[PDB]
Amino acid sequence: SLTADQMVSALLDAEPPILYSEYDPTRPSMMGLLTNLADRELVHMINWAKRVPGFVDLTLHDQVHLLESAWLEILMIGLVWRSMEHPGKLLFAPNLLLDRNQGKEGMVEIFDMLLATSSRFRMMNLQGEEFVCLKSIILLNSGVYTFLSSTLKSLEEKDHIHRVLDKITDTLIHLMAKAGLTLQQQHQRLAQLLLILSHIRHMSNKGMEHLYSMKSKVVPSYDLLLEMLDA
Amino acid sequence: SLTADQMVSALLDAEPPILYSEYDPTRPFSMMGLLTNLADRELVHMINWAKRVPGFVDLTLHDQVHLLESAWLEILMIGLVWRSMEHPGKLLFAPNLLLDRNQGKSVEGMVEIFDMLLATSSRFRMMNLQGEEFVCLKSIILLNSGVYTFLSSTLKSLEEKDHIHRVLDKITDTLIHLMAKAGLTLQQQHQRLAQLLLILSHIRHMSNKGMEHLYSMKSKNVVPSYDLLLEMLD
Ligand SMILES: CN(C)CCOc1ccc([C@H]2C[C@]3(C)[C@@H](O)CC[C@H]3[C@@H]3CCc4cc(O)ccc4[C@@H]32)cc1
Numbered sequence: 413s414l415t416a417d418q419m420v421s422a423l424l425d426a427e428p429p430i431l432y433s434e435y436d437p438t439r440p441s442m443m444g445l446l447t448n449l450a451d452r453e454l455v456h457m458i459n460w461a462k463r464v465p466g467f468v469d470l471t472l473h474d475q476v477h478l479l480e481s482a483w484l485e486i487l488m489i490g491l492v493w494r495s496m497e498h499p500g501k502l503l504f505a506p507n508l509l510l511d512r513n514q515g516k517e518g519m520v521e522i523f524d525m526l527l528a529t530s531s532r533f534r535m536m537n538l539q540g541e542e543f544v545c546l547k548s549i550i551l552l553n554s555g556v557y558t559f560l561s562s563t564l565k566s567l568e569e570k571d572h573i574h575r576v577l578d579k580i581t582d583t584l585i586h587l588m589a590k591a592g593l594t595l596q597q598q599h600q601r602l603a604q605l606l607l608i609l610s611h612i613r614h615m616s617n618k619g620m621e622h623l624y625s626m627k628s629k630v631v632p633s634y635d636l637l638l639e640m641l642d643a
Numbered sequence: 644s645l646t647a648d649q650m651v652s653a654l655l656d657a658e659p660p661i662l663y664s665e666y667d668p669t670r671p672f673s674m675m676g677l678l679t680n681l682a683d684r685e686l687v688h689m690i691n692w693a694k695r696v697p698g699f700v701d702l703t704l705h706d707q708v709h710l711l712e713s714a715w716l717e718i719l720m721i722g723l724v725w726r727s728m729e730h731p732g733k734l735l736f737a738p739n740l741l742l743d744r745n746q747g748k749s750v751e752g753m754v755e756i757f758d759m760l761l762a763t764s765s766r767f768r769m770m771n772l773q774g775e776e777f778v779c780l781k782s783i784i785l786l787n788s789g790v791y792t793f794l795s796s797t798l799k800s801l802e803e804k805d806h807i808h809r810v811l812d813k814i815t816d817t818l819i820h821l822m823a824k825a826g827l828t829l830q831q832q833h834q835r836l837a838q839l840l841l842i843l844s845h846i847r848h849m850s851n852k853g854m855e856h857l858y859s860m861k862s863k864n865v866v867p868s869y870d871l872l873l874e875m876l877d
């Protein structure tokens with residue numbers, strides 16, 4: 413029942429904080445810093461996911477499935493968003509801005525992919541309001557095709573998810589109309605934004621490939637995610 | 644310069660044929676071998692199709708190879724999902740190779756992917772995806788999949804990226820026009836456009852999982868090389 417303006421207000425209000433890397437800056441490695449940062453960001457991501465309109469209407473199992481599918485894409489879109497005003501570098505945290513040379517485990521290709529994404533956001537002059545919409549779309553869409561369930565409940569859950577996704581589409585279009593874009597510019601920009609999400613999916617897949625290769629007891633389990641969502 | 648109708652006409656005409664699996668149907672019924680040979684032959688036709696997608700051959704041959712390298716398995720997959728739409732619970736790899744979920748388990752690499760593909764065809768059916776929309780989506784995959792990974796900012800590459808995005812914009816216009824022709828409201832148009840493009844993220848995911856398996860095989864030419872793709876495009 414939320415208006416487009418109310419949807420934007422809700423998403424802006426739900427935004428998680430920007431966290432810091434944990435290292436003492438007076439002291440003279442990187443994977444441990446990034447892993448600890450991501451570990452702390454995931455806790456705040458669960459809080460954010462619960463404030464995305466329609467997300468807590470789903471079952472806890474479906475909430476876990478969506479977050480299990482989307483968490484690294486959500487970390488990556490956040491990283492790209494905070495790196496937009498840092499050409500050629502990635503702002504993992506305010507105290508951890510790395511260039512491509514510093515990027516050289518698992519980042520041989522991904523670093524450049526992330527840089528290219530932030531470059532594209534810059535080319536498009538992506539707005540904060542648009543960004544939070546995109547991030548919510550990732551949460552709701554990434555796992556919606558892989559519930560592996562044809563129960564009556566699951567059919568209803570998928571319908572709900574797509575209704576909420578439709579509302580966010582309406583909201584994105586509304587933001588563009590507010591800005592004075594023509595109808596043609598509106599549907600072109602909508603398409604351009606959603607097509608970037610495929611690239612973010614690609615980057616997450618490559619990132620998840622590395623995390624699994626580590627064989628470190630480093631990918632959040634279903635049961636960990638379930639514990640956090642119901643806490 | 645193409646109009647929306649002309650863009651659709653062009654894409655419909657560029658459509659590759661549906662190929663058959665190569666096995667003797669009188670012999671006892673090898674699945675990965677059959678599927679690989681099928682895909683090998685499909686890829687040859689895919690290159691012909693790609694060259695007929697408006698705007699594609701305007702690109703440098705290097706950039707054409709890069710786009711196809713990025714997109715080819717996605718394109719095979721959306722093709723598969725399209726020709727499986729009217730076969731719930733099954734995948735029509737070829738007209739003489741219709742596999743169900745149980746048979747899917749006989750296929751290495753498909754423990755999760757088979758169900759993912761089925762879910763996509765189910766979603767296409769629920770949306771009543773039209774042929775005109777399908778060819779638009781397939782062209783979008785070709786142009787979009789590799790456009791952020793050129794790893795070049797030569798003046799030429801800047802121009803190539805702009806061109807690609809202008810063509811992508813035209814296909815967006817074309818999709819919206821098809822929906823308007825069908826009498827959808829403006830709200831329904833932008834909702835459906837979004838629904839269609841969001842499925843492309845799932846298709847990328849499936850391709851990445853498929854590519855993971857192909858690389859795991861450590862089989863020469865089971866992933867087409869850059870030079871193989873270049874030889875076919877040229
Ligand atoms: C969350 N806990 C439960 C599990 C730890 O997950 C992690 C641990 C480390 C990262 C780092 C390290 C990588 C995966 C590299 O290898 C290849 C891509 C890297 C990503 C990039 C995205 C990203 C964004 C962030 O803002 C913080 C960390 C990271 C990552 C990302 C997620």
Ligand SMILES: CN(C)CCOc1ccc([C@H]2C[C@]3(C)[C@@H](O)CC[C@H]3[C@@H]3CCc4cc(O)ccc4[C@@H]32)cc1
Binds near residue numbers: 685
């Ligand atoms: C093209 N030549 C140069 C290289 C061979 O590429 C191949 C070889 C075999 C396939 C098969 C086997 C798989 C990858 C499984 O493993 C996991 C996903 C499978 C995909 C599914 C998509 C697909 C669609 C087709 O219409 C024909 C084959 C296939 C594939 C797909 C592509």
Ligand SMILES: [Mg+2]
Binds near residue numbers: 588593
């Ligand atoms: Mg704008």
